[PDB]
Amino acid sequence: QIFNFSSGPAMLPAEVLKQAQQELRDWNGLGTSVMEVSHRGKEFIQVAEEAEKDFRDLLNVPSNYKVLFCHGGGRGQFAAVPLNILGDKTTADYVDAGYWAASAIKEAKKYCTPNVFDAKVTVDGLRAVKPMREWQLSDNAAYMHYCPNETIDGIAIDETPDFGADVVVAADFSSTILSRPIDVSRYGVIYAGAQKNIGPAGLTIVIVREDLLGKANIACPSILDYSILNDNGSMFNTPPTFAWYLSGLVFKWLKANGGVAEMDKINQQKAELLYGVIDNSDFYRNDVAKRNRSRMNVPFQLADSALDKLFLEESFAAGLHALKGHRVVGGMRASIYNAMPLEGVKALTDFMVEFERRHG
Amino acid sequence: QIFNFSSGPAMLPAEVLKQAQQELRDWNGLGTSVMEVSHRGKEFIQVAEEAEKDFRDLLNVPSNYKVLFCHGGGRGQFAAVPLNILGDKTTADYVDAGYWAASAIKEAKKYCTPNVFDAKVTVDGLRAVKPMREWQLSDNAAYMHYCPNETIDGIAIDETPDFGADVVVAADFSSTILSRPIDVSRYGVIYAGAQKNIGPAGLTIVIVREDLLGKANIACPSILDYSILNDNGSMFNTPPTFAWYLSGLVFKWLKANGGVAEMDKINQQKAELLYGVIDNSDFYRNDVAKRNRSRMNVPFQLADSALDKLFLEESFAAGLHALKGHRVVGGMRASIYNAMPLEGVKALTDFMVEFERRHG
Ligand SMILES: Cc1ncc(COP(=O)(O)O)c(CN[C@@](C)(CCC(=O)O)C(=O)O)c1O
Fold this sequence. Notes:
The PDB classes it as aminotransferase. The complex is a heterodimer. Chain A is an alpha/beta fold. Chain A has helices at residues 14-22, 42-59, 73-85, 99-108, 226-231, 241-256, 259-280, 308-317, 342-359; strands at residues 3-4, 65-70, 91-96, 113-118, 120-123, 126-129, 144-146, 149-150, 155-156, 169-172, 189-193, 204-209, 284-285, 297-302, 320-321, 332-335. In chain A, strand 3, helix 4 (99-108) and strand 4 (113-118) form a beta-alpha-beta unit. Chain B has a seven-stranded mixed β-sheet. The longest helix of chain B is centred in the last third of the chain and has 22 residues, at 259-280. Chain B is globular and about 60 Å long. Chains A and B meet through helix 1, helix 3 and helix 6 of A and helix 1, helix 3 and helix 6 of B. The complex binds a molecule of 2 linked components (PLP-GAM). A molecule of 2 linked components (PLP-GAM) sits between chains B (7-8, 73-75, 100, 147, 151-152, 172, 174-175, 193, 195) and A (40, 237-238).
């Protein structure tokens, strides 16, 4: 078997893919593909609603939150948030503690003067993040934005926000959503591209608190306008029908396997197994504090970088794909999302030990 | 067999879909799906480049035009064009002659004060469009916008633009591109959502003349910024990888079948067959002038609208799906894109005659 450690687009559940394949040309006895069906037809509309319903059950999303499905991916959202919830304030709080947290800030500059807070710190030579109670927010700010899971850095902030009514929290859960249960009520906006932990590329999920709607800037393209999307049930224009369909299958696969509570347990074992191998070895090394170690994305450097190529050739031949670290960082990176079975994180750890043994 | 006359998402070539199905879980002997592979990997990048190359060969797109692949669909473009090529001007020419031509104007209002030209005219009781030589353009206008093929109205403007080298033409080819050969050099911008005549929903193709780049409004979200997309090879952020892949298969299917010249030849005999049945019958009727009849979308009303329901039940049982007209116009509508074979069109005309001979 092959185990894909790509970070996005990512590996999808084998069952989900085995089904999509089978009914690719004859979905629902219709004799056509879901891709060929009109988005307005009752057949698809049922898929779309069921999709949202399952999603709400999974995260316990309360009635006062709208769940939208749009184009653009995560970066489209770096623009959408400012365009939608900035209202008429001229600033917003942005917490930088990683590559993605920073990218969001760069886009935000187009629409306002963002107050940046550098939450990055180094403790015991290990990369960590300042606790929320130490974050500097401003008074005038329309909202505060931050990223709970840096895909490149392997940094995670699991702390639950506790700023109080006055503050609106916007977060980028692209690479962590559905990995652990979260209290949605603490947030104002939660967005996430599907290509990492949900489904395929092309679709993006957004969770907005209803009272935040109706403030959109006139300049906001209608396809990004939260109010427009909500009023049309995420069907203002033709949506990524196939992507929405697969997401639906994934959501079902999740409920079928115990929901996010069970996923959280499994994700915990997978992370511990891997991080256990890295810490106990001299050959491999991760430089992130225990308190901030992501369970989704795990970057690691080799003691001898001259072996990087050989590690990649041998890991690939062993059926372990996409282990190369991000471009701007080098090293290695194993992304172990919900779809990645513990059995797979084991195959990787088995290989890593065997490599260290005969090359280390 | 089943013949899907949906107007978007539309029917895809049977070969293209068979293939996509076969290698759904093991694409390129990789043992993974194209959906699970990263867009930064060499495997996909080769698909993406090959995709663009085939597309350029098909339409003979000269070196001074960039070909972009983005999110948002056609309605994302109603915003993108104004945001990108409006430059430092405050007004643009917009030619209304249909639902889509009008929708574009509606979005444009967000970014400027558009000069609208009503090209709609009724000749002999038949709906027609004023010839381009009679179109009123303004002096200060940053560009002129129009839609050569109204999907809902069944109106088509095949006339080749010939205004001043000073005039910049932007067009919405969503439902007609690749149906007949066109002289790209006449246009400044050509955009089109893939769900109609190319591939699946989620992807959008744009053809921009290079000298038009670098004018983008600061407010334009980066994912829509033509310059940003060009600089990153349409890979600024994760793109709709599966959609891009299918489009590639379609482009190959086209070259394999004779290119746009052969398609034009077949599309002509599909249109003539159908319009021949409608004109020669008293039961069915299309009210569009021969000079403006779309060969892609063919709307038709029944003489007795009380039979609409029965026409739909019987046509569906006969394996002819999605024949219902649009909500706004009512009636019926057969969309016969490139993927729709002549055998499929004949099957429809055979049915229409039979139905008449039994209820008319
Ligand atoms: C000619 C044309 N331009 C733009 C669009 C909008 O496409 P997206 O919704 O942004 O992908 C379309 C769409 N035509 C549809 C599919 C509209 C259906 C609907 O009610 O939304 C059609 O069936 O005509 C164009 O045709």
